[PDB]
Design an enzyme around this catalytic site. Structure first.
Site, mmCIF file in Angstrom:
data_model
loop_
_atom_site.group_PDB
_atom_site.id
_atom_site.type_symbol
_atom_site.label_atom_id
_atom_site.label_comp_id
_atom_site.label_asym_id
_atom_site.label_seq_id
_atom_site.Cartn_x
_atom_site.Cartn_y
_atom_site.Cartn_z
ATOM 1 C CG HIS A 122 59.355 47.083 44.301
ATOM 2 N ND1 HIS A 122 59.807 46.187 43.358
ATOM 3 C CD2 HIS A 122 60.412 47.347 45.103
ATOM 4 C CE1 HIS A 122 61.091 45.944 43.560
ATOM 5 N NE2 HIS A 122 61.483 46.643 44.610
ATOM 6 C CG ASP A 199 54.788 44.160 47.364
ATOM 7 O OD1 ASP A 199 55.403 43.694 48.346
ATOM 8 O OD2 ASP A 199 55.363 44.767 46.433
ATOM 9 C CD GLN A 202 60.127 47.980 52.566
ATOM 10 O OE1 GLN A 202 60.331 48.156 53.771
ATOM 11 N NE2 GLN A 202 61.107 47.737 51.702
ATOM 12 C CE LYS A 225 62.945 44.828 50.518
ATOM 13 N NZ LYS A 225 61.903 45.421 49.638
ATOM 14 C CB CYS A 360 62.452 49.015 42.533
ATOM 15 S SG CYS A 360 64.117 48.399 42.908
HETATM 16 C C1 LIG Z 1 61.929 44.871 48.318
HETATM 17 C C2 LIG Z 1 60.484 44.963 47.824
HETATM 18 C C3 LIG Z 1 60.051 44.099 46.826
HETATM 19 C C4 LIG Z 1 60.988 43.060 46.198
HETATM 20 O O1 LIG Z 1 61.357 42.112 47.159
HETATM 21 P P1 LIG Z 1 62.568 41.044 46.820
HETATM 22 O O2 LIG Z 1 62.793 40.191 48.037
HETATM 23 O O3 LIG Z 1 63.822 41.798 46.449
HETATM 24 O O4 LIG Z 1 62.143 40.146 45.681
HETATM 25 C C5 LIG Z 1 58.738 44.217 46.398
HETATM 26 N N1 LIG Z 1 57.929 45.109 46.932
HETATM 27 C C6 LIG Z 1 58.307 45.953 47.877
HETATM 28 C C7 LIG Z 1 57.306 46.963 48.439
HETATM 29 C C8 LIG Z 1 59.606 45.900 48.357
HETATM 30 O O5 LIG Z 1 60.003 46.786 49.358
#
Ligand SMILES: *Cc1c(COP(=O)(O)O)cnc(C)c1O
Ligand SMILES: *Cc1c(COP(=O)(O)O)cnc(C)c1O
Lengths: 402, 402
Positions: A122, A199, A202, A225, A360
């Site tokens: 992302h 990160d 997800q 999320k 993104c």
């Molecule tokens: C949505 C997402 C982000 C960004 O998260 P935000 O809460 O919008 O700051 C970063 N990495 C991944 C893999 C995402 O799915």
């Protein structure tokens, strides 16, 4: 065990009509719907327990401060952190990653060093490291993709050296659904003395996550999320690193016009201004709700739903899928030579919410030589009927438009 | 016609008991209670209209995006900005001021320049300027206080010179309730070519605010003090300045691993990550609620309540008040030689919520040669009967403790 009918009854938005049709919401990867338990927990806090939380002496403020710190403890048990004080309330994953890049990054990455990311990241896990490598004069290296949407793990020994300070890596791809081999990557990174930021935006809604077993140094995810409110996320940092991180910008402690400024101790050091207490209360309720369902129960339902969808999608002519067979959560696809946004517009006209675009992840799109993809998310409240509406819709679009 | 009884019926928290007694919430300057209209607006969004907003094309996403932009327009009308695109959604006042200091400040304040603040500023309007003056080698100058809690306006002409780049000044003090003479200060600053940032976090709930009439260059305030949700605030920037401000750290536009990164245009440029759409919707409802009551009606009721409180507090032995006679919103005080925290703790026993400590204004405390003050807030939902309980409680503490 898991009952999708009983789960769906908790989500008032699932009764919505769009374009005169019952909604089929297949975009939870962008943001998840919220159960009544989460919505009502935040509302009840505002209705009956609201106050400021910054060291207030009076009863309402003391009780609100306790509610916030209990959510920090609940979040730390959720990801099996060793201590509640290893968790920082951030505005979201984007802000959490940038916090690490500035506080930790500016103090640990210098001219001549390198940082490793992957081609599937992302943008939120690319730009802070591009900027940092520009501030200090370091090099950004990139793990390349395979056609099946996995990373080329065998390139990692060549990309790591004694100058590699950090690996920044997604747990689960937001486009491809790939789950990366974190345990092996972290083992390799630590042998070179590098740290690893994960990160996990997800991952945390799909199965249990254990940061002690992963041994990751930073882990970040987003509340919205994870069936929770907007404006709140979690950054986990190993205590040994967190207590050494210098201030970035309950964060300011003392101010003198002649003697300067001091900052509070971590994790509060990195929570400037007034906390989003409403979002924190809602996030705590989301963790309770998910934990009550059971993440292993969620994982089994979602895995079986994914297997059904993939088998059904085989009957769609000219469909191109992107990603591995064992994908989690999301199905990325394109239909023939049709523009992704046209496919998305027809699906929306059929009451089906999917996301189209670059998601993104423009470098990922570049790897597959397409400008955009369609993406369907299959979350714990989605059903076979909604999968069937997606499949019949794609068949309908192919029949009408060639 | 303002009716405090009709207003109080909208705030469910006011029916709460604290330590077994009916709550007297005199801490709205720390954070305001919220009306049901605000709580329910946010909950109804989550129940029936929730989706991601980052330029999603499907129906729910497009509708959620329009709701967010309609709040931006409503907020621009609330402060009489020229354009809705002069407003940036920030996490709060603290973040808004830091944004100006980092994007505008780093590009407009250089070695040998100076910035002027005042001795009554909140820490959030001190520390960003202290650190900027260190990053660039500039001087931080301070407007001194008078004993009555007003600023020494006659010192301003000597503090300004042709090297002064910015005046950062509070509209209304969060401790003393002093309303500063912004018209005169802005006229003087502009004569020297300086810009003016106004910290309006304690002004926008008390009377109409008009940024075109003030002609301020930046204006910032917090949603949670304006009867709205946590985690949301507003930064106003004049269009000519805003469109020249560069990015610092929908905000990412494009990302390339070979060609770098581009950013969206302002105001969206400074709204990174996922918007706090829940808080934005609630903020919109708070502006609607306040505007329907009428800010001039609110101002009249609060001023009469303040006059009553000050008249009744004359019957408290050993009470020291700090601030001018025409204070807005708050009464700062200490009782005899007693520690502020002890006074506040005893009042909490009587069900009365006040704030104690340095109130994020340690230079102000140092000027008055005290470590702390008590602070009672008198907001639009407070009553003469609550004032009477404060007076009786202070009289009781004086009798019990000496
Ligand atoms: C949505 C997402 C982000 C960004 O998260 P935000 O809460 O919008 O700051 C970063 N990495 C991944 C893999 C995402 O799915
Ligand atoms: C509350 C306040 C601030 C800080 O606002 P936050 O929303 O906590 O960031 C700054 N200045 C003044 C005058 C305030 O009253």
């Amino acid at each position: 065990i898991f009952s999708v009918d009983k789960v769906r009854a908790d989500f008032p938005v699932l009764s919505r009509e769009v374009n005169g049709l019952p909604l089929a919401y297949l975009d939870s990867a962008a943001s998840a719907q919220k159960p009544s338990q989460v919505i009502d927990a935040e509302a009840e806090f505002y209705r009956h327990g609201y106050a400021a939380v910054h060291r207030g002496i009076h009863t309402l403020s003391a009780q609100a401060t306790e509610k916030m710190e209990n959510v920090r403890k609940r979040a730390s048990l959720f990801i099996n952190a060793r201590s509640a004080e290893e968790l920082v309330f951030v505005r979201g994953t984007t802000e959490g990653i940038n916090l690490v890049a500035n506080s930790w990054g500016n103090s640990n990455v210098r001219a001549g060093d390198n940082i490793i990311i992957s081609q599937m990241e992302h943008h939120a896990n690319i730009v802070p490291w591009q900027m940092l490598c520009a501030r200090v004069g370091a090099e950004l290296r990139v793990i390349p993709l395979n056609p099946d949407g996995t990373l080329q793990l065998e390139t990692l020994p060549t990309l790591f050296d004694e100058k590699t300070r950090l690996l920044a890596i997604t747990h689960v791809s937001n486009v491809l659904g790939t789950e990366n081999p974190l345990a092996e990557m972290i083992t390799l990174a630590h042998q070179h003395g590098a740290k690893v930021l994960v990160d996990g935006a997800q991952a945390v809604m799909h199965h249990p996550v254990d940061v002690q077993a992963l041994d990751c140094d930073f882990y970040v995810f987003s509340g919205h999320k994870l069936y929770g409110p907007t404006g709140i996320g979690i950054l986990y940092v190993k205590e040994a690193l967190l207590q050494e991180m210098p201030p970035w910008e309950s964060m300011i402690a003392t101010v003198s016009l002649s003697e300067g400024t001091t900052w509070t101790k971590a994790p509060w050091r990195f929570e400037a201004g007034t906390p989003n207490t409403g979002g924190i209360i809602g996030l705590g309720a989301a963790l309770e709700y998910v934990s009550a369902l059971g993440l292993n129960n969620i994982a089994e339902y979602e895995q079986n739903l994914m297997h059904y969808a993939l088998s059904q999608l085989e009957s769609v002519p000219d469909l191109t899928l992107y990603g591995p067979q064992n994908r989690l959560g999301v199905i990325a696809f394109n239909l023939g030579k049709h523009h992704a946004y046209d496919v998305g517009s027809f699906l929306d006209n059929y009451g089906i919410a999917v996301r189209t675009g670059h998601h993104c992840a423009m470098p990922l799109m570049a790897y597959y030589n397409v400008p955009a993809m369609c993406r369907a998310s299959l979350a714990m409240y989605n059903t076979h009927e909604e999968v069937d509406r997606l499949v019949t819709g794609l068949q309908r679009i192919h029949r009408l438009l060639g």
